[PDB]
Amino acid sequence: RDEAGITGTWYNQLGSTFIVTAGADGALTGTYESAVGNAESRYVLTGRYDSAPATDGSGTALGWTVAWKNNYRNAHSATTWSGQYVGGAEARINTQWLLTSGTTEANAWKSTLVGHDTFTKVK
Amino acid sequence: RDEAGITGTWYNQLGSTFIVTAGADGALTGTYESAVGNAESRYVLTGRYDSAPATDGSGTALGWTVAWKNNYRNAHSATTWSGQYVGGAEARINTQWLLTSGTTEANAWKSTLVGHDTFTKVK
Amino acid sequence: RDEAGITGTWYNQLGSTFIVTAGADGALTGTYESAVGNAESRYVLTGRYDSAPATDGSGTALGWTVAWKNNYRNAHSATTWSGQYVGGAEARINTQWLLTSGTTEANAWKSTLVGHDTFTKVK
Amino acid sequence: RDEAGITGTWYNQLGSTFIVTAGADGALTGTYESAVGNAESRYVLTGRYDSAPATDGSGTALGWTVAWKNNYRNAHSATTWSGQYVGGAEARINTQWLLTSGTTEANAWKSTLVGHDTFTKVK
Ligand SMILES: [Cu+2]
Ligand SMILES: [Cu+2]
Ligand SMILES: [Cu+2]
Ligand SMILES: [Cu+2]
């Protein structure tokens, strides 16, 4: 268990800030603030992580969601990040994400962006 | 708001079952049971949805996570689904997902599966 | 070998038309015409397929690319489809695709769409 | 046009080697050698690029395919890379890829890996 390793404040290559608490039972709760896009201030996030990972050197699988509505803005979209926590001197969360926008059915083909974010504890 | 449209039991093309409650504030909570893979019985899920969607005919953006640990099994992996709810006689949730396994750093290149699930209220 | 099974005209769920020739050596060459997006008329495609698939009932892995420039339009983008051919009465090509647009480095995070197309020999 | 900027030998973060020729007309032809996976020696690749990119500082969209069959091995799979070329002192190709394996229909849900490769002209 990486409850203590995951809990805290993380930053990605875009300058976004992810603040998370890891529960003993697998929960992830916190706030996300994007440095880019149709976003301002903090948004709620929730997710899950493997609270009993393999002990063979593998990372810890996890994921979370942000719906891009808060008191300031509504971007009618949601991002999910799916990835793994890798602990140690230079801890990281390595993720791939899917960002779906609400669309009409005629536009659904162009609804979903894909990308990759790497989070560190410094910067 | 689609709190009432989303809340309930959904089934995908693989025969998996998704049971969700939508909160007024954007939360999604419930259980997932996969018909395939290294899985048995129910697993916790959490996620978020846009609680004030566009009124122009667009769908409602949402996402959720399952970490594949429960009292029965641990598949050292997490799936995130990112998609949209489309209401009406034949309501659907149309998703794309990312399934990340915990790996060593040598294996990280092969850590993540991608696919697509369509959920309906019947079958 | 599925050289004869793959070669010919295919249609997807959007009404796009894919015309391909499969070479003995693994090549795929042809034209694509999209029913959606910043596209008109035919565009060049090239790709590769497994010319000696497994004989255990598995599908035949393949992929191809279209750059969205022709004599009519330039959408400064490219799509790659990665998938498998499944032969038999109701033959199909089942794909997932990635559509990357040229962007500035500030915009690179929003450069790439993801989706899924299923091609059949009728419709 | 980036025919001269793209043509040549590129290396990714895994130590794989991509050797490509860019044609005046949008073609990409060459060989790929993976440092990882069920692969040995060189494999054929083909693809396409935007031969008349935007002049506003944007990158050049491109993609290519490798089917993992050569005279040595057959991994019954294909990878497609979709991305953009960014020119200048530290030129790069920034990609996302989809790796589909031939599967039975029961296994199709687990057929496709997703990841991201960054190619440079040194290392
Ligand atoms: Cu206010
Ligand atoms: Cu028990
Ligand atoms: Cu003309
Ligand atoms: Cu030999």
Curated annotation (Swiss-Prot), chains A, B, C, D:
It is found in: Secreted. Biotin binds at Y32, Y43, W81, W97, W109. GO terms for molecular function: biotin binding. It comes from the Bacteria. GO terms for cellular component: extracellular region. Residues 3-123 form the Avidin-like domain. Homotetramer. Keywords: Biotin, Secreted, Signal. This is Streptavidin. The biological function of streptavidin is not known. Forms a strong non-covalent specific complex with biotin (one molecule of biotin per subunit of streptavidin). Belongs to the avidin/streptavidin family. It comes from Streptomyces avidinii. A motif (Cell attachment site) lies at residues 48-50.
